[PDB]
């Protein structure tokens, strides 16, 4: 599984960075992408391939990973920045699956 | 009408309404309680292949 | 590309409930579906997808021997079948797609989602 810290929190402008602490077998080995979910509406994609960010996502935005754990960086906090973030990576060993994170809630003040 | 002999004279009669979709066929096959979106003289298809 | 599921469900524990999920565009499609749930209060889980052409299905560990996809091609349909069901299988489901035709971490499009309640 993935370990994210359960809440974090921060003023409006500021900088906000999100971790994730898997193992050699999910995170190590493969990619991670991140997935912002708004109350009520499904989950949406926010980053992928690590670093890219698909079409429509602004450039405050960013993610990155080294070793073990992976980053998910967001500057400029707005007051409707504040979901549910989720990191997921394709697990590989006895049989391959999607797993997700446990999620941190984003409260902004 | 107007008659002094001989006439068979109309006592029903019907209001039509009209709808695209519809006709007569002939068939011996019985029927039952399904549903499908084509009929045959033969039986019902569901499918979406492109031909029969 | 729009995902729309079926309606909502409500069903006896020990029952077996399938759902549906219908894309737009051509009815061939050269991407993979998967399936994924979400419990009121809980993150999302995945379930289990299926490939184009080759027909390959793939489920999850948690999920395997209860659950089964299916796909119509010449209707664009996916089906998906859940059997044994108890109280923690209430949830919210949603059918994803990927960029490519391999099952992977990264999902582009997500449907409306349909809820199944026992
Ligand atoms: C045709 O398919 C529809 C779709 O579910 C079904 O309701 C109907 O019973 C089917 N009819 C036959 C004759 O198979």
């Known amino acids: 599984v993935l370990t994210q810290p359960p809440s974090v929190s921060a003023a409006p402008g500021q900088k906000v960075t999100i971790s994730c602490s898997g193992s050699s077998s999910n995170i190590g080995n493969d990619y991670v992408s991140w997935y912002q979910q708004l109350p009520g509406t499904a989950p949406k994609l926010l980053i992928y391939?690590?670093?890219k960010r698909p079409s429509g996502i602004p450039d405050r935005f960013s993610g990155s990973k080294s070793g073990t754990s992976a980053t998910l960086g967001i500057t400029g906090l707005q007051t409707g920045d504040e979901a549910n973030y989720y990191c997921?990576?394709?697990?590989?060993?006895?049989?391959?699956?999607?797993?997700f994170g446990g999620g941190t809630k984003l409260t902004v003040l | 009408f107007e008659a002094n002999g001989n006439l068979i004279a109309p006592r029903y009669a019907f209001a039509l309404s009209r709808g695209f979709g519809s006709g007569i066929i002939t068939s011996n096959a019985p029927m039952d309680e399904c549903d499908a979106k084509c009929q045959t003289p033969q039986g019902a298809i569901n499918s979406s292949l492109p031909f029969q | 590309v729009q995902l729309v599921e079926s309606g909502a469900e409500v069903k006896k524990p020990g029952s077996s409930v399938k759902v549906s999920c219908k894309a737009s565009?051509?009815?061939?499609?050269?991407?993979?579906i998967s399936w994924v749930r979400q419990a009121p209060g809980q993150g999302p889980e995945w379930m289990g997808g299926?490939?184009?052409?080759?027909?390959?299905?793939k489920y999850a560990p948690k999920f395997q021997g209860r659950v089964t996809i299916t796909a119509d091609d010449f209707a664009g349909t996916v089906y998906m079948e859940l059997s044994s069901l108890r109280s923690e299988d209430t949830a919210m489901y949603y059918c994803?797609?990927?960029?490519?035709?391999?099952?992977?971490?990264?999902?582009?499009?997500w449907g409306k989602g349909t809820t199944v309640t026992v």
């Open positions: 391939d690590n670093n």
């Open positions: 299926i490939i184009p052409i080759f027909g390959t299905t």
């Open positions: 565009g051509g009815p061939f499609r050269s991407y993979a």
């Open positions: 997921a990576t394709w697990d590989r060993r006895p049989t391959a699956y999607v797993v």
């Open positions: 994803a797609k990927h960029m490519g035709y391999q099952v992977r971490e990264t999902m582009d499009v």
